[PDB]
Design a protein around this motif. Structure first.
Motif, PDB file in Angstrom:
ATOM      1  N   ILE A  21     -12.635 -27.435  -0.146  1.00  0.00           N
ATOM      2  CA  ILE A  21     -12.361 -28.661  -0.901  1.00  0.00           C
ATOM      3  C   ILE A  21     -13.208 -28.720  -2.166  1.00  0.00           C
ATOM      4  CG2 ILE A  21     -11.613 -29.926   1.197  1.00  0.00           C
ATOM      5  CD1 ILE A  21     -14.277 -31.659   0.741  1.00  0.00           C
ATOM      6  N   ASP A  22     -12.661 -29.371  -3.189  1.00  0.00           N
ATOM      7  CA  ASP A  22     -13.394 -29.589  -4.431  1.00  0.00           C
ATOM      8  C   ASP A  22     -12.809 -30.755  -5.199  1.00  0.00           C
ATOM      9  OD1 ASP A  22     -11.659 -28.629  -6.975  1.00  0.00           O
ATOM     10  OD2 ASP A  22     -11.371 -27.135  -5.426  1.00  0.00           O
ATOM     11  N   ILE A  23     -13.613 -31.246  -6.143  1.00  0.00           N
ATOM     12  CA  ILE A  23     -13.103 -32.121  -7.195  1.00  0.00           C
ATOM     13  C   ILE A  23     -13.138 -31.332  -8.519  1.00  0.00           C
ATOM     14  CG2 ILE A  23     -13.545 -34.220  -8.543  1.00  0.00           C
ATOM     15  CD1 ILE A  23     -14.502 -35.531  -5.947  1.00  0.00           C
ATOM     16  N   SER A  24     -12.103 -31.525  -9.335  1.00  0.00           N
ATOM     17  CA  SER A  24     -11.981 -30.846 -10.597  1.00  0.00           C
ATOM     18  C   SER A  24     -11.720 -31.807 -11.734  1.00  0.00           C
ATOM     19  CB  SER A  24     -10.851 -29.827 -10.491  1.00  0.00           C
ATOM     20  OG  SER A  24     -10.504 -29.272 -11.741  1.00  0.00           O
ATOM     21  N   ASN A  25     -12.408 -31.581 -12.854  1.00  0.00           N
ATOM     22  CA  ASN A  25     -12.126 -32.209 -14.167  1.00  0.00           C
ATOM     23  C   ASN A  25     -11.434 -31.263 -15.162  1.00  0.00           C
ATOM     24  OD1 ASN A  25     -15.225 -34.052 -13.876  1.00  0.00           O
ATOM     25  ND2 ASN A  25     -13.130 -34.828 -13.667  1.00  0.00           N
ATOM     26  N   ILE A  26     -10.918 -30.145 -14.656  1.00  0.00           N
ATOM     27  CA  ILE A  26     -10.299 -29.105 -15.508  1.00  0.00           C
ATOM     28  C   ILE A  26      -9.052 -29.628 -16.186  1.00  0.00           C
ATOM     29  CG2 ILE A  26      -8.993 -26.867 -15.345  1.00  0.00           C
ATOM     30  CD1 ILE A  26     -11.313 -26.192 -13.191  1.00  0.00           C
ATOM     31  N   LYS A  27      -8.416 -30.627 -15.558  1.00  0.00           N
ATOM     32  CA  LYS A  27      -7.298 -31.336 -16.149  1.00  0.00           C
ATOM     33  C   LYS A  27      -7.656 -32.768 -16.584  1.00  0.00           C
ATOM     34  CE  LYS A  27      -4.147 -28.044 -15.518  1.00  0.00           C
ATOM     35  NZ  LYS A  27      -3.830 -27.405 -16.830  1.00  0.00           N
ATOM     36  N   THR A  54      -8.181 -36.809 -12.754  1.00  0.00           N
ATOM     37  CA  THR A  54      -9.234 -36.351 -11.825  1.00  0.00           C
ATOM     38  C   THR A  54      -8.501 -35.782 -10.582  1.00  0.00           C
ATOM     39  OG1 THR A  54     -10.376 -38.366 -12.481  1.00  0.00           O
ATOM     40  CG2 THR A  54     -11.450 -37.003 -10.749  1.00  0.00           C
ATOM     41  N   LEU A  55      -8.878 -34.606 -10.081  1.00  0.00           N
ATOM     42  CA  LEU A  55      -8.130 -33.972  -8.972  1.00  0.00           C
ATOM     43  C   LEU A  55      -8.972 -33.743  -7.768  1.00  0.00           C
ATOM     44  CD1 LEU A  55      -6.330 -31.205 -11.038  1.00  0.00           C
ATOM     45  CD2 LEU A  55      -5.323 -33.369 -10.104  1.00  0.00           C
ATOM     46  N   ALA A  56      -8.477 -34.157  -6.583  1.00  0.00           N
ATOM     47  CA  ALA A  56      -9.023 -33.649  -5.324  1.00  0.00           C
ATOM     48  C   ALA A  56      -8.205 -32.411  -4.915  1.00  0.00           C
ATOM     49  CB  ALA A  56      -8.981 -34.717  -4.247  1.00  0.00           C
ATOM     50  N   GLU A  57      -8.876 -31.281  -4.682  1.00  0.00           N
ATOM     51  CA  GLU A  57      -8.155 -30.024  -4.460  1.00  0.00           C
ATOM     52  C   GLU A  57      -8.549 -29.449  -3.120  1.00  0.00           C
ATOM     53  OE1 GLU A  57      -9.537 -27.855  -7.984  1.00  0.00           O
ATOM     54  OE2 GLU A  57      -7.598 -28.311  -8.901  1.00  0.00           O
ATOM     55  N   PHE A  58      -7.596 -28.826  -2.434  1.00  0.00           N
ATOM     56  CA  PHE A  58      -7.890 -28.330  -1.082  1.00  0.00           C
ATOM     57  C   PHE A  58      -6.997 -27.152  -0.694  1.00  0.00           C
ATOM     58  CE2 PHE A  58      -4.292 -30.805   0.457  1.00  0.00           C
ATOM     59  CZ  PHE A  58      -4.298 -31.901  -0.364  1.00  0.00           C
ATOM     60  N   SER A  59      -7.610 -26.239   0.057  1.00  0.00           N
ATOM     61  CA  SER A  59      -6.896 -25.172   0.735  1.00  0.00           C
ATOM     62  C   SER A  59      -7.310 -25.193   2.185  1.00  0.00           C
ATOM     63  CB  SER A  59      -7.173 -23.825   0.053  1.00  0.00           C
ATOM     64  OG  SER A  59      -6.402 -23.781  -1.142  1.00  0.00           O
ATOM     65  N   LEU A  60      -6.330 -25.322   3.075  1.00  0.00           N
ATOM     66  CA  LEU A  60      -6.670 -25.603   4.486  1.00  0.00           C
ATOM     67  C   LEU A  60      -6.448 -24.362   5.353  1.00  0.00           C
ATOM     68  CD1 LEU A  60      -4.918 -29.124   4.922  1.00  0.00           C
ATOM     69  CD2 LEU A  60      -7.225 -28.675   4.029  1.00  0.00           C
ATOM     70  N   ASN A  61      -7.324 -24.146   6.339  1.00  0.00           N
ATOM     71  CA  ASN A  61      -7.131 -23.079   7.371  1.00  0.00           C
ATOM     72  C   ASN A  61      -6.941 -21.737   6.696  1.00  0.00           C
ATOM     73  OD1 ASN A  61      -6.723 -24.983   9.889  1.00  0.00           O
ATOM     74  ND2 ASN A  61      -5.134 -25.591   8.396  1.00  0.00           N
ATOM     75  N   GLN A  62      -7.909 -21.366   5.859  1.00  0.00           N
ATOM     76  CA  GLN A  62      -7.876 -20.086   5.139  1.00  0.00           C
ATOM     77  C   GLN A  62      -8.927 -19.255   5.848  1.00  0.00           C
ATOM     78  OE1 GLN A  62      -5.568 -19.553   2.613  1.00  0.00           O
ATOM     79  NE2 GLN A  62      -4.929 -21.560   3.378  1.00  0.00           N
ATOM     80  N   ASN A  78      -9.098 -36.549 -21.703  1.00  0.00           N
ATOM     81  CA  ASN A  78      -8.423 -35.261 -21.528  1.00  0.00           C
ATOM     82  C   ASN A  78      -9.444 -34.150 -21.519  1.00  0.00           C
ATOM     83  OD1 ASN A  78      -5.489 -35.702 -21.693  1.00  0.00           O
ATOM     84  ND2 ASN A  78      -5.924 -36.432 -23.777  1.00  0.00           N
ATOM     85  N   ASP A  79      -9.110 -33.053 -20.839  1.00  0.00           N
ATOM     86  CA  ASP A  79      -9.856 -31.793 -20.997  1.00  0.00           C
ATOM     87  C   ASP A  79      -9.503 -31.168 -22.364  1.00  0.00           C
ATOM     88  OD1 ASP A  79      -7.208 -31.254 -19.650  1.00  0.00           O
ATOM     89  OD2 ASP A  79      -7.701 -29.287 -20.526  1.00  0.00           O
TER      90      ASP A  79
END
Length: 207
Positions: free
Chosen positions: A100-106, A86-94, A146-147
């Motif tokens: 921010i998001d959560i992903s189940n892609i992996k 399970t992933l917490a994903e982030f890109s800051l100051n763009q 698994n995905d």
């Protein structure tokens, strides 16, 4: 920005934090049940990820193995971890915004809430029992679900042509966690926050 990483699970996890080519802060730490680990992430960090690893053994120099999310055998992750995670994903100051998001892609290993601790956006959660419900073909022996890309390695599951649809497997992740990405071209569940926000990641936010 500061991220507080909280293990509310009844079991130990080994938190990891990376942008894929480099550790974020120390990159990894053991968290017993209830422990919090505060990290600093440089502004402008793009493609950062936080995840939990389960059932790890490390020796005295931080070298070992985890059953889910292992990042090449290290305590302190430099690289992304092996699925299922399970992933917490982030890109800051763009351009003045954080994303921010959560992903189940992996895949999924541990339930998670990813919330701002500052004002001006809402958080996202994937807290359903995905492991218990996981389709038999996606069940990882180590623990975890698994995905389909990881398991089957087809153009359709991996969206390698840039065109792909939802699948029986992506729909499973989506039905249990509508707020997390279930496949590469899923309708985005990204949350836009004010530039320079702060955040909490909580593992097992429910139980």
């Amino acid at each position: 920005a500061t991220f507080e990483i909280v293990n509310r699970c009844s079991y130990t996890v080994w938190a990891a934090a990376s942008k894929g080519d480099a550790a974020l802060d120390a990159g990894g730490r053991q968290l017993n049940s209830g422990e919090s680990w505060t990290i600093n992430v440089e502004p402008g960090t793009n493609g950062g990820k936080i995840w939990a690893r389960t059932d790890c053994y490390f020796d005295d120099s931080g070298s070992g193995i985890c059953k889910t999310g292992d990042c090449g055998g290290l305590l302190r992750c430099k690289r992304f971890g092996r699925p299922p995670t399970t992933l917490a994903e982030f890109s800051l100051n763009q351009y003045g915004k954080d994303y921010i998001d959560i992903s189940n892609i992996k895949g999924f290993n541990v339930p998670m809430n990813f919330s701002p601790t500052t004002r001006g956006c809402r958080g996202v959660r994937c807290a359903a029992d995905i492991v218990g419900q996981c389709p038999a073909k996606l069940k990882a022996p180590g623990g975890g679900c698994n995905d389909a890309c990881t398991v089957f390695q087809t153009s359709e599951y991996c969206c390698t042509t840039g065109k792909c649809g939802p699948t029986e497997y992506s729909r499973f992740f989506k039905r249990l966690c509508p707020d997390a990405f279930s496949y590469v071209l899923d309708k985005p569940t990204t949350v836009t926050c004010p530039g320079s926000s702060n955040y909490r990641v909580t593992f097992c936010p429910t139980a």
